[PDB]
Amino acid sequence: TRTVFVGNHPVQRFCDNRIVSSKYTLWNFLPKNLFEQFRRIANFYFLIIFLVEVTVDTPTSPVTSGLPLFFVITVTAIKQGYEDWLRHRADNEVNKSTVYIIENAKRVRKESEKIKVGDVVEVQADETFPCDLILLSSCTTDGTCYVTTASLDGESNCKTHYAVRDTIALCTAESIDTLRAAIECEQPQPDLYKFVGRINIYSNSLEAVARSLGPENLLLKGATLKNTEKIYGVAVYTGMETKMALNYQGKSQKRSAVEKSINAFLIVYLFILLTKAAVCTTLKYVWQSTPYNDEPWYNQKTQKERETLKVLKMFTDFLSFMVLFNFIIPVSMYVTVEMQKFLGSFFISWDKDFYDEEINEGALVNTSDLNEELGQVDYVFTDKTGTLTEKLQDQAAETIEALHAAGLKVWVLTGDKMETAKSTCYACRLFQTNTELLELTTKTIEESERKEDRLHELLIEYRKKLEHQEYGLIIDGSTLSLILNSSQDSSSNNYKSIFLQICMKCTAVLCCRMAPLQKAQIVRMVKNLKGSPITLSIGDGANDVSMILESHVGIGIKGKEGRQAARNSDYSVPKFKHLKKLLLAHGHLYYVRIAHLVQYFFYKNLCFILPQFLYQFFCGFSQQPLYDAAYLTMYNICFTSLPILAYSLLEQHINIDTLTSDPRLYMKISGNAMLQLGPFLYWTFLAAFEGTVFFFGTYFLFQTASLEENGKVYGNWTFGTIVFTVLVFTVTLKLALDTRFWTWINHFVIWGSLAFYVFFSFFWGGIIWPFLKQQRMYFVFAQMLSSVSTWLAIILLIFISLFPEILLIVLKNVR
Amino acid sequence: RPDNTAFKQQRLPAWQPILTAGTVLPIFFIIGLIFIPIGIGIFVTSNNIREIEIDYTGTEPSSPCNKCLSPDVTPCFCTINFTLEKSFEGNVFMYYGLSNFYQNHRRYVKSRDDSQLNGDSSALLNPSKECEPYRRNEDKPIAPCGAIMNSMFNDTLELFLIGQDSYPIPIALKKKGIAWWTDKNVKFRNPPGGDNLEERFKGTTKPVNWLKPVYMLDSDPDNNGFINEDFIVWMRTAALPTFRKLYRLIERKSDLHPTLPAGRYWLNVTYNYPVHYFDGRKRMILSTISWMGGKNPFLGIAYIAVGSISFLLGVVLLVINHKY
Ligand SMILES: CCCCCCCC/C=C/CCCCCCCC(=O)OC[C@H](COP(=O)(O)OCC[N+](C)(C)C)OC(=O)CCCCCCC/C=C/CCCCCCCC
Ligand SMILES: *[C@@H]1O[C@H](CO)[C@@H](O[C@@H]2O[C@H](CO)[C@@H](O)[C@H](O)[C@H]2NC(C)=O)[C@H](O)[C@H]1NC(C)=O
Ligand SMILES: *[C@@H]1O[C@H](CO)[C@@H](O)[C@H](O)[C@H]1NC(C)=O
Ligand code: ALF
């Protein structure tokens, strides 16, 4: 119980009226953001690899490991800082607004954040209440004011509130010189329809009166005075302790299922890299245990290498193997993912099918990091008023039908009343004449003892002992509060678990009379289910912000309720019907493109590095690179970079028109299907097989005196060049075989990558370069191309490597 | 209203090929009918190559060359006896081969100064640190520096055909035209400081394992210094620990006589190169060439095998499709 003095006059110390929704300040932004970014395993590993390349050893420059890491870190920091600065601007708009305080018999113009608990606040018509106020008096003689609470429950209907009867006569300067009172009220809580308090109006008769206070006397922050000229109230709860602030949660970091799969793949490949390095180091020191294996007469060490401590040399050799094989974790993949996420998001904003003539606006992209999440939705939590209705929206029922045909569950979370919400659900055809409604409301339940009986009955004798379309669930806010506040101190007989069990096999769930935090709580409950369903919430009001921030991807509607939902959402669309195109076509395409990009990046880098690992068994495990340093540098920059980027931005494995007309195709990629264990193992074993084929085909080709008609001999650089040529052609042709949607851009990048590989090989190996310290590749490529047997071997190895893919193509397209 | 362009509306004209069993099945027959004859051709071409390999390491006591493993007199000579059962008809190529020699070791591969080997005046007097501990000797730079240069193979191999009167007929060997044209003529160059080579290497010293300096490798001025072809052939490091290096060319005669007639031959060996300290072996290889190079059955066998597998799988799929 908190005690509030009406005019801060004798007849505690609370927070101020300032609201905060940002997470950074100016001074701590860089430390906090860098600490959060480098707490991630990928960034930490990239930093460690860059440091090792700088300090110990590297086959290429440390620049090619430091610059991409800096780029990724800087891009992420800029995005997060801009979003937090937008939150700062919104907080500054909410604060700094003009409020009027009756300080000493006079109206004092102050700032909204400067309101104290226990001061008289004057609010005029059409003005939002700056804090939680107890209504003391109005202009009218009946002490009644009308209020709209659209920002709290999403409804435009007027609500009636009553002033304190002993203070209804206090107007003008009579509210300070004739008002000495104290209010005893509860601690702040988010219920939004429950208030317990008592006011003690002291007078000169020494006989103070006591009047109980209820929610009818409380003017909540965010509500608007309507049709009342002027009211007088006293602050009882101030910013971060008002019910609006207590129904706000704040956004946790949102990570896609594709990002989580990227993290898992990175962990697997980190284990692979460490295993390769450890095997190479162990075999190197077993090999060097022969005194002519280490330091033969023709390959002698310097004095420094001989006088280098053995343990330090072992550690350094392990690090050298690590940097030799580090390419199997590509930072170019992260760079390309950032680029593809940024560039591909423009299709949503360009899409003319999202353009609405009434508001002269199309779709809005706030985050480009969740494009692939639009193709993985499992649950849709929709607001009712202004989202499903305008009378429904243009194609609300048809959109719900398409979402059902896509395999999605649609639940309605509304701050509106049960009867109107249920009528809308019948109009939207979420509930049919055949649907049997199970009602967990205040009509069917009057105490917490009957609630458990209802839950048990809907479990064990109605629904589990069964016809999925047979049942629908209706629950109101108070019963949900009972469930969420009375299911503690238990794990097995969890009534929250029983409620979720009832919900999961109902054809639809209606949650009515919701508070803003309760929608987020429902979304969170669904998010914690077994199997980790992906959640989408959509709404048009400021009371949908909490569930929009809570869900995996939040959709704001550009309607008449303002722009708070749109500004806090990941994506914004004018109409609810646009969700069909946003998910079925855009999200499907985004998921398929990025999943293929991730798998292809890992596969092509394993194909790149495995022959280099195999080459250690034929040198002295000496960390000798199989390829030239320029080839190592531009494998991912110039030779195999653009085709996958063009694929991930243009590929339509299924046409957009087909994707829009067939919602059932959404279920093919339903549970992160393209990045599961099966596909991952397929890609990994294909890469391993192809790398083995590369290296050992070249090895068996080199079991001859000459591959030329002039009898001349090739060396280690030609060996590596042949392996690299087969590798580049194989990975490019694998992507080409995977391609189903060939634009002129795709033709250009795919064929020009190979043409540029040949042209660069000729140009780089054409001129004795006067600025490098070695000429190891002067005519290696040109000499290799003079060998007919080398051409034939390259062609045969390319065909052998692509044979499993061709065989899979012919098998999967028969019977 | 948004921009209704084909790129922005994701409706660019595309090809959209279809890959099905019925349209890809004939490739499993075309590939077979192309690969099998090519594989047979490669296999037949590789079988007609005439090759002989003679090991002269001398590790076994019964070897004409055990007396050269640990010698007393400096120049140890050994002759080995071998027979050519069939005449070598075309151009013949003489190779020496080394086993268990890691020319691909990382410390070995970097032990060179390519600016010095390209005839750069500053690099001639200041060889790179990468070619150490073979960089300086007696307070002078080493003119060819590095381990690769220092370890240059230096055995002398000559061939004699035993005539009808027991008189050995020497087979003429050519030391030119064995290296890559571009690394003889561009990559490897000599210092430009005049015309006499002994003066152009004024402030340098020879490799420590060298007997004579780099300007006494040959009397022919086009094969003398850094452009000596034996030196260049050695300096192009090998890919695998067992390798071959082109040594001499035995050109076919202007007449239609065999280049190496069948009979009895001698192998004059001046044993200078030790390999038994690291368990290596030394071979001499005589071989003929073709369009495919030397003798290697791998390419022909692999082409035949892949073509046959492709054809068999195509037949299996075609029979499956005709079950109806
Ligand atoms: C004819 C038609 C077909 C085409 C023919 C081919 C022609 C050639 C054209 C290709 C060029 C296209 C470029 C596409 C991107 C490829 C590069 C990339 O994406 O690959 C990152 C690369 C390679 O990485 P890797 O995996 O090989 O690992 C490094 C290996 N290791 C770790 C062992 C050292 O690495 C790097 O060199 C970094 C380069 C990438 C950019 C990141 C660096 C930017 C600098 C940072 C500044 C900060 C900016 C922050 C944001 C400011 C706001 C705008
Ligand atoms: C042939 O090559 C061998 C191997 O390099 C040379 O042997 C070295 O000779 C130098 C100089 O006498 C000695 O200091 C080294 O100890 C020798 N090394 C070995 C492993 O024996 C030999 O001198 C060369 N003979 C020539 C040039 O005819
Ligand atoms: C090598 O030189 C002569 C030259 O005819 C050859 O006959 C002999 O067998 C070999 N050894 C020596 C030096 O006697
Ligand atoms: F409009 Al609502 F829940 F905010 F139906």
Residue numbers in the entry:
A (entry chain A): 19 to 29, 38 to 416, 651 to 726, 743 to 1091
B (entry chain C): 27 to 350
Task: Show passages lifted from the paper.
Closely related P4-ATPases, ATP11A and ATP11C, act as major phospholipid flippases in the plasma membrane of mammalian cells, with strict substrate specificity for phosphatidylserine (PS) and phosphatidylethanolamine (PE), but not for phosphatidylcholine (PC), thereby contributing to the asymmetric distribution of PS and PE across bilayers. In contrast, flippases, also known as P4-ATPases, translocate their specific substrate phospholipid from exoplasmic to the cytosolic leaflet of the bilayer coupled with ATP hydrolysis. Most mammalian P4-ATPases, except ATP9A and ATP9B, require an accessory subunit, CDC50A, for their proper localization and functional expression in the plasma membrane. A previously reported disease-associated Q84E mutation in ATP11A confers the ability to flip PC, implicating the involvement of this conserved residue in substrate specificity.
The cryo-EM structure of ATP11C Q79E mutant in the PC-occluded E2-Pi state revealed a PC molecule in a reshaped binding pocket. Due to the Q79E mutation and associated conformational changes in its surrounding residues, including Ser91and Asn352, the binding pocket has additional space to accommodate the bulky choline headgroup. The nitrogen of the quaternary amine in PC is located more than 4 Å from the carboxyl group of Q79E, suggesting that it does not engage in strong electrostatic interactions. A detailed comparison of the WT and Q79E mutant structures revealed that the respective side chain rotamer conformations (i.e., Q79 in WT and E79 in Q79E mutant) are different, each rotating approximately 90° relative to one another. Due to the rotation of Q79E relative to Gln79 in WT, Asn352 makes a hydrogen bond with Q79E, thus the side chain conformation of Asn352 also slightly changes compared to that in WT.
